[PDB]
């Protein structure tokens, strides 16, 4: 059962920094099947990324995903104020879904 | 959501072939991308897939060695190298986009045919045997027919012997000419485009399949067989 | 392409629950559709999962013996039934498209919040 | 007079083997020499010719530009290199004498197989339809069969139509789901190693081939095909 | 006595392609050599000749000012090259020996099939106007149908008045909205695939073709007309 | 509010055209401008679109890679340029504003005619084939009419067998000499403008399709066929 | 439970024959019997049908006023009286127990053949006119045939023109005789077994059903027409 | 897991022979390995055995002496190498996995056909 | 040296039918350590039935071996077409493994 590890568990930034999230699983991730989603206070999940480095249609550049196998990464690029939110990586590659903990960007 | 293919045509045997077909309306560098073929009034056959770059690409047993599959996803272009090619590849070739579980193969190009061939406008000469099959005993005649879609120049039509797990024994040549150590139980006649082989008693060791064959032109063709059983 | 979510509220330990999922916008009858929660101030979890005919149906392991999903194609609606409800089942529950290497959870519900409490 | 014949096996696809074949009793350096095969349960085919020097040496389409024949007539020997092999060269090879008037194919080697083969000794899912043909009215019902060899993992089944001189169109997929834009009178259902394709009341343009296909491993199948008039 | 061809294949409109045809068997630097093509389920279709230096080189109609025929007696070959190609283009092409008294096309190429498609399909909405011709007096009641082969969205379905030697004018637009300016007496209904053009009262005026039109998507398709007589 | 429209006329096959449309009474830079087209006695039909700054612009499958659509806001100028004109592009063409949801296509230009041909005639000898169909027994005899517009000079008129894939087989030639192969079965006759051939005693090899040819002049013709089924 | 059927036989045309069905195991007075039949080679066929004393005797519109349906319950005996007995009885006849829903014909009697013939046949000599069907313009060639399986003696063989609702009309006779009145672009010919109506150029009023008619011998027969539309 | 044969063909008596099998699939190493042949129109007939380094490889009576089973697990690769061939040896070859009390000759090769003719 | 004994050396039966194949060894297999192969022609053998009675995985439920000892049993209750080939018993009980003579089934 495949565990995703989010760090750091909380990001405090100021808007145009860049946020650096690392999402770690326990085991490889087959065909790279991850996917990171944002949620702001009370609204469902948002897809960003998907196939590890997929951009959804209408998410901005400025999201980026990579990595393969354990170790995957999120970037934004310059941060705006309406990306301060909390942020999930997801694996679909078994039969027995699992998400990360999340990483609050503040 | 469409596949344009192009390429193909009529080739040498031997020869070399690129075939290609280019996706728009998706995202072309996620999904997995197989070529598909069918031989004139046969069925469908798998030939070679690809994947992303973390993948292998997998061919046919029929195409391994010789075709190579590839793609450049900044053209959303997928590719067949065909090298080698021969008489068995000759069929209509298909790019198709496979979905799996979200739809197999849901998307197909048009198609483009593939013939290697390094002959003329005329066909070869065509040898039926009939009847397929006869079951007969010990003692009885039996009476197998050849027949050629062309005359057969200078009676040039011979008839073999096989046995199962044995090659090919002569026994007529010339239409009607004894082989050396042959039974004079077995005696060929006809002309032109009509060829009989008669066994006149048939003993236990005559149970084999019989084949006709002329040998008239460059071009050697053998029937199809009739089996004695 | 939007899926319409239904259900919910306060409920008794030991009560019982139907979430609905109107969906609209796309092949509803031939989609993998999934339900997810999330407990207050916790991270999202894969609840259940149901796709085509001839395809298993999937539950975590939490909810397996208690929570029932199913499909009615014909009205394009996913449901969850949800038996034998305590206090851990509190959460918010969304129903999502889920579109594997085409866009994982590309499609999410608005979300239903289910309050297990006496 | 005697054809030693040696070599064959099993061979990867993409691979090279090299066929020998050793006479005596006769004058080898005159003679002309000529390769046949013949595929598991098939008939009789020319492969390749070679004779004086002189002459042409002459090639079936089937093998033209991959293969060799060649002779070394100071050690009465007929060779054969055969490259970048492909399974529908998998066949029993014989060397033979070629007399034309004076015996045709009269000497036989005793014939060497050659198999072209990447897989183990499972074999590949076998898709078996049934039956093979549908005559059938407009508005009346088609009842098409899929029988698997082994069961298809996951229901991981699909269907096609397809019209005379059109690419095949996905009509289901995962055995029971039908793609977008398919009209209703088409359904899928079944499981395991049993599937049925039901059309509930034909309509004129439902008249093609349907061909059933499984992906649930890495060597995809199709069945044969049904044709419904 | 043969003709080998290579070449053809599927290109894409506007593309360029060049036959090949090698001669064997007869001079062929003295011969009168043709081009014929057949598209598919069509007839028989003259190209293009050549012929002996000091001879002319005839061109069909349709393919003057595209086509190009050649020859190289060097090496027996003969070329034909195709530019600026079309669906009209799509054929088996043919090369032939032209004997005149002696025996007309007596010798012919196997031929190459040439496709000329940017696509492959199909997928468009279909739309069918019935009936084709209604004869109907002043003061009748014309009703058209318009069916759609899927759902037109939105209704977003026209329809068109054209007179001979006119451009089309707007009746009804959204399936149910009269054109500014449109008598009363026409009236457009239905939804999904069925729609309806209600012509009240027949004027003498209102005598002449009606075309229905979907554009709910990116690919715009008109019904083939109803003619009011 | 209207669309002047310009250009076209008569050009020859592989040309080239530009055809322009001038609004006036509309915002035109906020519009989406089409070209509709309809062929001679035929229905309309879509051609290309194009829209805002940020153009997504579009064909039909036949013209891509032949037209380009294009417009100059600042002159309030809609454009099609045409290149690789043939036979089959030769309409009336109309520039429309589409409306959309508010109108479909409510402004037409008056159309411009686009003629593509190499000369006026099609001044060539017509040859009738009788019937198009026959349905016969084997054994029975076929007799296939071939009547002529003109006089057919020297009797040079040719028949040839088509099989089904295959090229066309010579059968007779200068009205009624045999080629060389043909059985005795196959005899034509006639002279001026009525030849017949006639299979006197239909063998199962004999279904096919047979076409009459004149080459009495510089302009080959062909039959459109008879089928014998 | 049981059904003992006697009865039938072979007997001439207009002729009678009485069936019987014994029956035991079950209270046959309260059960209603059934007669059914089945043509050679053809479907069953409901006849008649007995039941309580106080219900109506029901027949099929083919028998009814020839056939009678009766039963003797101190007998435990069905019987089917058949007069005017025509070839067109020719069946299989079987008595059944009616159960309706309990069980419908769940007790049928084993059959027994009932067969009315006059002693066919035979010796007449079959005509067989091809094609079925020509589908021709005015002013082209119509060939018609007439084959027979015996030879003609003296040629004694006529053809006939039909338009619908009138009678035929006599076009040739003595195979090559072209009756009074008939315009000279019909003409027969023929000998033996093969014999041949030829319209030379049609005109509009020749567009009918065509017979020939052998009046050889006592037995006078007609082939079954070629319709020239 | 899959056994890929290869070798076999037409020799001469006295002549020598080296049949393949390359196993994919599972753990090669571990696994115990058998050549078995099949003389045409007859039975089955076990050949020879190899396991692990240490353990004894074993022969039939007709082949001990001419025969020699090995091994390559770095290439995860079977061999038979077949001397002194007579046209007794004239069989169908196959190799296969043996899996004992959990599954016997459960995974076989597809057999290559060795003929010894003069 | 155990040998294995199977009859009948040919069963011609008919597709419904029950074929019932016999097994019998010279000595007791130890543990019933044998196994069931079915061949058809041109193809290699394949497991049916081992350990006596265990019926491989993908095997249908038609097939089912008995006995113990030194008689032993493979029946197919309801033979279908695809089940017309030769039957081979195994035994692996010892270092030299042998085979029965084999069973047609036709």
């Known amino acids: 059962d495949i565990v995703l590890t989010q760090s750091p568990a909380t990001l405090s930034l100021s808007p145009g920094e860049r946020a650096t999230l690392s999402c770690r699983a326990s085991q490889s991730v087959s065909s790279n099947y991850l996917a990171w989603y944002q949620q702001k206070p009370g609204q469902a999940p948002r897809l960003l990324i998907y196939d590890s480095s997929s951009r959804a249609t209408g998410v901005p550049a400025r999201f980026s995903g990579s990595g393969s196998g354990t170790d995957f990464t999120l970037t934004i690029s310059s941060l705006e104020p309406e990306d301060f939110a909390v942020y999930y990586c997801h694996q679909y590659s078994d039969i027995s879904p699992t998400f990360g903990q999340g990483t609050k960007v503040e | 959501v469409q596949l344009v293919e192009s390429g193909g045509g009529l080739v040498q045997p031997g020869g070399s072939l690129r075939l290609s077909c280019a996706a728009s309306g998706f995202t072309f560098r996620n999904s997995a991308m197989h070529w598909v073929r069918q031989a004139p009034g046969k069925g469908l056959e798998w030939?070679?897939?690809?994947?992303?770059?973390?993948?292998?690409?997998?061919?046919?047993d029929s195409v391994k060695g010789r075709f190579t599959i590839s793609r450049d996803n900044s053209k959303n272009t997928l590719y067949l190298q065909m090298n080698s090619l021969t008489a068995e590849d000759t069929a209509v070739?298909?790019?198709?986009?496979?979905?799996?579980?979200?739809?197999?193969?849901?998307?197909?190009?048009?198609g483009t045919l593939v013939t290697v061939s390094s002959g003329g406008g005329g066909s070869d000469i065509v040898l039926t045997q009939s009847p397929a099959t006869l079951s007969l005993s010990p003692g009885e005649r039996a009476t197998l027919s050849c027949r050629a879609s062309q005359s057969v120049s200078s009676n040039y039509l011979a008839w073999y012997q096989q046995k199962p797990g044995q090659a090919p024994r002569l026994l007529i040549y010339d239409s009607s000419s004894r082989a050396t150590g042959v039974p004079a139980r077995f005696s060929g006649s006809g002309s032109g485009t009509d060829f009989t082989l008669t066994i006149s008693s048939l003993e236990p060791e005559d149970f084999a399949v019989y084949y006709c064959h002329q040998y008239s032109d460059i071009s050697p063709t053998f029937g199809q067989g009739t089996k004695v059983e | 392409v939007q899926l319409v979510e239904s259900g919910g509220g306060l409920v008794q330990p030991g009560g019982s629950l139907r979430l609905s999922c109107a969906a609209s916008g796309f092949t509803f009858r031939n989609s993998a559709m999934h339900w997810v929660r999330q407990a207050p101030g916790k991270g999202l979890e894969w609840?259940?999962?149901?796709?085509?005919?001839?395809?298993?149906?999937?539950?975590?392991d939490s909810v397996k013996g208690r929570f029932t999903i199913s499909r009615d194609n014909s009205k394009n609606t996913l449901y969850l039934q949800m038996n034998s409800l305590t206090a851990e089942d509190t959460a918010v529950?969304?129903?999502?498209?889920?579109?594997?290497?085409?866009?994982?959870?590309?499609?999410?519900?608005?979300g239903t919040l289910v309050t297990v409490s006496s | 007079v005697q054809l030693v014949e040696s070599g064959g096996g099993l061979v990867q696809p993409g691979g090279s083997l090299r066929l020998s074949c050793a006479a005596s009793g006769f004058t080898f350096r005159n003679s002309a020499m000529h390769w046949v095969r013949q595929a598991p349960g098939k008939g009789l085919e020319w492969?390749?010719?070679?004779?004086?020097?002189?002459?042409?040496?002459?090639?079936?389409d089937s093998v033209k530009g991959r293969f060799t024949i060649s002779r070394d007539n100071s050690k009465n020997t007929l060779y054969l290199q055969m490259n970048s092999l492909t399974a529908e060269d998998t066949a029993v090879?014989?060397?033979?004498?070629?007399?034309?008037?004076?015996?045709?194919?009269?000497?036989?080697?005793?014939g060497t197989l050659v198999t072209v083969s990447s897989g183990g000794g499972g074999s590949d899912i076998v898709l078996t339809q049934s039956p093979a043909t549908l005559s059938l009215s407009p508005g009346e019902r088609a009842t098409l069969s899929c029988r698997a060899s082994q069961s298809v993992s996951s229901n991981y089944l699909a269907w096609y139509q397809q019209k005379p001189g059109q690419a095949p169109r996905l009509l289901i997929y995962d055995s029971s789901s039908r793609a977008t834009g398919v009209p209703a009178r088409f359904s899928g259902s079944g499981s395991g190693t049993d599937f049925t394709l039901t059309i509930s009341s034909l309509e004129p343009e439902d008249f093609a081939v349907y061909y059933c296909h499984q992906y649930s491993d890495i060597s995809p199948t199709f069945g044969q095909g049904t044709k419904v008039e | 006595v043969q003709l080998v061809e290579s070449g053809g294949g599927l290109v894409q409109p506007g593309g360029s392609l060049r036959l090949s045809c090698a001669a064997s068997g007869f001079t062929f630097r003295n011969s009168a050599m043709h081009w014929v093509r057949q598209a598919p389920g069509k007839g028989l279709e003259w190209?293009?000749?050549?012929?002996?230096?000091?001879?002319?080189?005839?061109?069909?109609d349709s393919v003057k000012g595209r086509f190009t025929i050649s020859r190289d007696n060097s090496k027996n070959t003969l070329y034909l090259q195709m530019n600026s190609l079309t669906a009209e283009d799509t054929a088996v092409?043919?090369?032939?020996?032209?004997?005149?008294?002696?025996?007309?096309?007596?010798?012919?190429?196997?031929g190459t099939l040439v496709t000329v498609s940017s696509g492959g399909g199909g997928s468009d909405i279909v739309l069918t106007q019935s009936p084709a011709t209604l004869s109907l007096s002043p003061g009748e009641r014309a009703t058209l149908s318009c069916r759609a082969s899927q759902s037109v969205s939105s209704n977003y379905l026209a329809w068109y008045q054209q007179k001979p030697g006119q451009a089309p004018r707007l009746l009804i637009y959204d399936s149910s909205s009269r054109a500014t300016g449109v008598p009363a007496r026409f009236s457009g209904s239905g939804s999904g695939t069925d729609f309806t053009l209600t012509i009240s009262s027949l004027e003498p005026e209102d005598f002449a073709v009606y075309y229905c039109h979907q554009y709910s998507d990116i690919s715009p398709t008109f019904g083939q007309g109803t003619k009011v007589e | 509010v209207q669309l002047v429209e310009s250009g076209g006329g008569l050009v020859q096959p592989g040309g080239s055209l530009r055809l322009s449309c001038a609004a006036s009474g509309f915002t035109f830079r906020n519009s989406a401008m089409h070209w509709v087209r309809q062929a001679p006695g035929k229905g309309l039909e879509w051609?290309?679109?194009?829209?805002?700054?940020?153009?997504?612009?579009?064909?039909?499958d036949s013209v891509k890679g032949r037209f380009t659509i294009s417009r100059d806001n600042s002159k309030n100028t809609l454009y099609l340029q045409m290149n690789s004109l043939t036979a089959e592009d030769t309409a009336v063409?109309?520039?429309?504003?589409?409306?959309?949801?508010?109108?479909?296509?409510?402004?037409?230009?008056?159309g411009t005619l686009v003629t593509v041909s190499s000369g006026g005639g099609g001044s060539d000898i017509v040859l009738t084939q009788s019937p198009a169909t026959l349905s016969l027994s084997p054994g029975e005899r076929a007799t296939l009419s071939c009547r002529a517009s003109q006089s057919v000079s020297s009797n040079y008129l040719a028949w040839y067998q088509q099989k089904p894939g295959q090229a066309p087989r010579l059968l007779i030639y200068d009205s009624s000499s045999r080629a060389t192969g043909v059985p005795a079965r196959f005899s034509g006759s006639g002279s001026g403008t009525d030849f017949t051939l006639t299979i006197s005693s239909l063998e199962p090899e004999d279904f096919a399709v047979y076409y009459c040819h004149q080459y009495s002049d510089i302009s080959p013709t062909f039959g459109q066929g008879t089928k014998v089924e | 439970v049981q059904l003992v059927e006697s009865g039938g036989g072979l007997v001439q045309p207009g002729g009678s024959l009485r069936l019987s069905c014994a029956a035991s195991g079950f209270t046959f007075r309260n059960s209603a019997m059934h007669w059914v039949r089945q043509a050679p080679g053809k479907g069953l066929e409901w006849?008649?049908?007995?039941?309580?004393?106080?219900?109506?005797?029901?027949?099929?519109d083919s028998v009814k006023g020839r056939f009678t349906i009766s039963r003797d319950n101190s007998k435990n005996t069905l019987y089917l009286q058949m007069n005017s007995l025509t070839a067109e009885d020719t069946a299989v006849?079987?008595?059944?127990?009616?159960?309706?829903?309990?069980?419908?014909?769940?007790?049928?009697?084993?059959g027994t053949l009932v067969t009315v013939s006059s002693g066919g046949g035979g010796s007449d000599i079959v005509l067989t006119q091809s094609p079925a069907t020509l589908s021709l313009s005015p002013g082209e060639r119509a060939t018609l045939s007439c084959r027979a399986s015996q030879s003609v003696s003296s040629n004694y063989l006529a053809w006939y023109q039909q338009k619908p609702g009138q009678a035929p009309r006599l076009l040739i006779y003595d195979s090559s005789s072209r009756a009074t009145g008939v315009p000279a672009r019909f003409s027969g010919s023929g000998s033996g077994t093969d014999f041949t109506l030829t319209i030379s150029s049609l005109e509009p009023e020749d567009f009918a059903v065509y017979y020939c008619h052998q009046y050889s011998d006592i037995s006078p027969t007609f082939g079954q027409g070629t319709k020239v539309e | 897991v899959q056994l890929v044969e290869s070798g076999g063909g037409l020799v001469q008596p006295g002549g020598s022979l080296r049949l393949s099998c390359a196993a994919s699939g599972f753990t090669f190493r571990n696994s115990a390995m058998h050549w078995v042949r099949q003389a045409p129109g007859k039975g089955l007939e076990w050949v020879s055995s190899?396991?692990?380094?240490?353990?004894?490889?074993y022969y039939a009576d007709s082949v001990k002496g001419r025969f020699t089973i090995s091994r390559d697990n770095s290439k995860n690769t079977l061999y038979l190498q077949m001397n002194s061939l007579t046209a007794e040896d004239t069989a169908v070859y196959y190799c296969?996995?043996?899996?004992?009390?959990?599954?016997?000759?459960?995974?076989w090769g597809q057999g290559t056909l060795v003929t010894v003719s003069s | 040296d155990i040998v294995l004994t199977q009859s009948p050396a040919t069963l011609s039966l008919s597709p419904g039918e029950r074929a019932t194949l016999s097994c019998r060894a010279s000595q007791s297999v130890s543990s019933n350590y044998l196994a069931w192969y079915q061949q058809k022609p041109g193809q290699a053998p394949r497991l049916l039935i081992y350990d006596s009675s265990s019926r491989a995985t993908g095997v249908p439920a038609r097939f089912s071996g008995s006995g113990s000892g030194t008689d032993f049993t493979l029946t197919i209750s309801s033979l279908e077409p695809e089940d017309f080939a030769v039957y081979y018993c195994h035994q692996y009980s010892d270092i030299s493994p042998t085979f029965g003579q084999g069973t047609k089934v036709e």
């Open positions: 190899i396991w692990y380094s240490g353990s004894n490889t």
């Open positions: 296969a996995r043996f899996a004992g009390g959990w599954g016997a000759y459960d995974v």
